[PDB]
Amino acid sequence: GSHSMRYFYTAMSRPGRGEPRFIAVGYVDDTQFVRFDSDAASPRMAPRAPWIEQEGPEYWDGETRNMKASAQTYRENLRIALRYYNQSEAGSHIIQVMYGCDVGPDGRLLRGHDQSAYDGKDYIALNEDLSSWTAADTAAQITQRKWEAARVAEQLRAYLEGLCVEWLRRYLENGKETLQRADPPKTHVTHHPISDHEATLRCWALGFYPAEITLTWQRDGEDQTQDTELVETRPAGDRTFQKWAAVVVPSGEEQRYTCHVQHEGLPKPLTLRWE
Amino acid sequence: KPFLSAWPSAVVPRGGHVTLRCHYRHRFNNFMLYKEDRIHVPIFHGRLFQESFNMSPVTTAHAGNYTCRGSHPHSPTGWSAPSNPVVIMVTGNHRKPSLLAHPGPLVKSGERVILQCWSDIMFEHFFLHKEGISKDPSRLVGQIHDGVSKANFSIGPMMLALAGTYRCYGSVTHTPYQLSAPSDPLDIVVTGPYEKPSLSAQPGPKVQAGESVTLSCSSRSSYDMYHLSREGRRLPAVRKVNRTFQADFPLGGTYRCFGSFRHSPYEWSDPSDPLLV
Amino acid sequence: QRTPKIQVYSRHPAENGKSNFLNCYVSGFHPSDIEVDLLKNGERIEKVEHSDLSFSKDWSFYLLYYTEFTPTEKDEYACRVNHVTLSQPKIVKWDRDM
Amino acid sequence: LSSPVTKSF
Ligand SMILES: *[C@@H]1O[C@H](CO)[C@@H](O)[C@H](O)[C@H]1NC(C)=O
Ligand SMILES: *[C@@H]1O[C@H](CO)[C@@H](O)[C@H](O)[C@H]1NC(C)=O
Ligand SMILES: *[C@@H]1O[C@H](CO)[C@@H](O)[C@H](O)[C@H]1NC(C)=O
């Protein structure tokens, strides 16, 4: 602990360019493990992580049925959205959904999530109590009174408290060696002249897991918070991550700058100096 | 390969209009069309469409199975692979068949319904079609029996995506893409799983010749609108002081009421308890 | 409508004459429809694979395109990206130091 | 495992 399981649905209309498309991906923490694309010949829920591949036929059958139903549902939801917002049937629109659970050190449920968006903007969300909704506009309000009538929140609460947590625990068990063993970053500092009076110091962290990490630059103990170039964390491609942090320094004071790295794969925090 | 599509519908009546679009390499720009067997013989004597092929008005000549090829220079032939087939079916060529629902048009969620399409005329094929833009019709062979041809379309497990208005068409042997006139429309409605409302009467269910009787449909759920149904009407709901939503239908027969929300005409709640007037 | 952020980088520390993987990581964009090509000496590398479409908590999409390459200092590698928010295709050249 | 709960808008 702690760990999370998330599902990401994307449903897209695209008149003239293709049939409506449904894509679903599953994550445990920062690792994707399943996917579904309705644009395949015979769409099936497919494995994306090696530790789920030895799950049996029953699992892929169940998930594929569920996903086909979800695809149908969300196509119709695109139609319904069209009516709700009084939009033309010639435009391209997108529904996004993310849902899932967070569990702690002992596998007990910490948090439930279920959020939905339409055309990039928040549409409707399940509240922390997992028994009510929050709608962002009037269409979303229609959806809310529908779901309240259908008692959706209770079924959702049921899924989040049981199946979601149990399967998450089983997954954390299937791939313990890659999901629960943090990979520490390989770190190093590089020097890149700008002017003859300025130079960039770049702190590199490579091949770390999981994705969350802290890279700071200190000038004699003070965090250069608002003068640090912090590039977004990026995937190496082998389920690990890369990050760097650059600080521009006056030449001759490279010594006064240190890079501090914290990551759960590290016993103690690192301090690096360019030499 | 290009993506071929018909707007707004592939099933189109005579006198109507349908546009064929060919999307290839992020362009609808430059394509040729083909029918079902002269596969490498472009129609209109090999006419190039610099624009989406608009057919208007639609005649029975237009009916057929289309594929398109996109202009791809620096390429084995200068043309792409064949696109997805798109069948233009022209309706209004024969007497309409009949369509009926078994057991009825009101279908509980998760349950199944049989849409039966039958006719006096010996149709070779039947097509079930749901009213809507970009929809494919379902085909079934016509069984001949006792002087009538018929076909049983099975629809289910019932969800909102299958609710709506249905028409069936017939086609004879030698003109497969020429369909009959549409049958009289059938509104298939899914009921539930929205909680059922309560039904009452004012002043009561016992009524004689002289005076008024109004049915009150009530629920704690925010139904936008109530439907009154008798065995064998539509009113907006008003929010009452005790936070109940209610409708009052000013009027024998057995009645039930169904709640429903806005912009969603084909999905109703579970039926209320019956109330006989 | 949101415009894509692009990163072009290797999976391992770049060393000339050694097997490696080239990554164009695109993110923060909306809608989903996007075009991404890995260029070598100006022209597309076929055998380019990409990850499945996912998105962030701000509902912005992200994708990883990648190919197997061998870095040399004669060859130049880049990534070309087109999107509805982009008037003209954006090209980001691979720099071993970024 | 993914949710079996229908979310019809
Ligand atoms: C349409 O044509 C394709 C090939 O040209 C064929 O495979 C398909 O069966 C045809 N569809 C119909 C409904 O005849
Ligand atoms: C077809 O539908 C109705 C009722 O199900 C009726 O004509 C007949 O019983 C059905 N035929 C079957 C199920 O073969
Ligand atoms: C709500 O108030 C109306 C008065 O118009 C009454 O007829 C109805 O029974 C009330 N509903 C409930 C649930 O008490």
mmCIF file of C-alpha atoms and ligand atoms in Angstrom, chain B residues 100-103 113-116 150-153, ligand 2:
data_model
loop_
_atom_site.group_PDB
_atom_site.id
_atom_site.type_symbol
_atom_site.label_atom_id
_atom_site.label_comp_id
_atom_site.label_asym_id
_atom_site.label_seq_id
_atom_site.Cartn_x
_atom_site.Cartn_y
_atom_site.Cartn_z
ATOM 1 C CA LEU B 100 -46.424 -6.067 -34.790
ATOM 2 C CA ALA B 101 -44.791 -6.625 -31.416
ATOM 3 C CA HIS B 102 -45.059 -9.781 -29.318
ATOM 4 C CA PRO B 103 -46.115 -9.576 -26.628
ATOM 5 C CA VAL B 113 -39.371 -8.890 -27.709
ATOM 6 C CA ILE B 114 -40.326 -10.335 -31.087
ATOM 7 C CA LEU B 115 -41.016 -7.912 -33.914
ATOM 8 C CA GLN B 116 -43.019 -9.781 -36.542
ATOM 9 C CA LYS B 150 -43.449 -13.426 -42.633
ATOM 10 C CA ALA B 151 -40.322 -12.980 -40.508
ATOM 11 C CA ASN B 152 -39.640 -12.861 -36.769
ATOM 12 C CA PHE B 153 -36.972 -10.378 -35.704
HETATM 13 C C1 LIG E 2 -43.159 -15.524 -33.964
HETATM 14 O O1 LIG E 2 -43.635 -14.491 -33.097
HETATM 15 C C2 LIG E 2 -44.984 -14.636 -32.612
HETATM 16 C C3 LIG E 2 -44.918 -14.772 -31.105
HETATM 17 O O2 LIG E 2 -43.634 -15.192 -30.664
HETATM 18 C C4 LIG E 2 -45.738 -15.779 -33.306
HETATM 19 O O3 LIG E 2 -46.094 -15.417 -34.639
HETATM 20 C C5 LIG E 2 -44.973 -17.100 -33.277
HETATM 21 O O4 LIG E 2 -45.289 -17.815 -32.088
HETATM 22 C C6 LIG E 2 -43.462 -16.879 -33.355
HETATM 23 N N1 LIG E 2 -42.822 -17.948 -34.106
HETATM 24 C C7 LIG E 2 -41.794 -18.662 -33.632
HETATM 25 C C8 LIG E 2 -41.321 -18.302 -32.254
HETATM 26 O O5 LIG E 2 -41.269 -19.558 -34.285
#
